[PDB]
UniProtKB/Swiss-Prot annotation, chain B:
Signal peptide: none
Domain HMA span(s) in chain numbering: 2-71
Region (HMA-like domain): 5-75
Coiled-coil portions: none
Top-rank taxon: Eukaryota
Tissues with expression: Expressed in leaves.
Domain notes: The HMA-like (RATX1) domain is responsible for the specific recognition of AVR effectors.
Cell compartment(s), UniProt: Cytoplasm
Part of the intact protein present: 996 to 1070 of 1116
Listed name of the protein: Disease resistance protein RGA5
Subunit text: Forms homodimer or heterodimer with RGA4 through its coiled coil (CC) domain. Interacts with AVR1-Pia and AVR-CO39 through its C-terminal part containing the HMA-like domain.
Amino acid sequence: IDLSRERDPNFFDHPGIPVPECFWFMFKNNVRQDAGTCYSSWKMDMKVGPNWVHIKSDDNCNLSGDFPPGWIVLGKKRPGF
Amino acid sequence: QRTKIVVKVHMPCGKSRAKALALAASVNGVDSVEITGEDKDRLVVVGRGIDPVRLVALLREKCGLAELLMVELVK
């Protein structure tokens, strides 16, 4: 998995709300399943394979969570962030 | 208390697709509804006040299939 190689997700930033800083990418056995945006220094709940997983982001978009085997969700700051 | 909720909704057509949008957008507290996804099978719902369990359950009965993908409170 190489995030610098991964294409940007399909995103639309809503005009009213603060612009999320991160791209996340979700893999099953190193195959890209989904991708999106999330806040840095924050927290989200996500469906990761079979589980509803609570995920923390640090200020450099490092995602941590208790992912089920074979799955991972990885982050990075969007361009210019 | 604004939150973003992404739901995977069975909507093959553009016409069950507009069904899902207007239905998600009828929910109390919603600010916007957008469809995204390579397969355009995602509803993105933003608002404050929304019960995600209620969102999905409604879309479920009215479109047949709906699963929560993510809930992110707006920072």
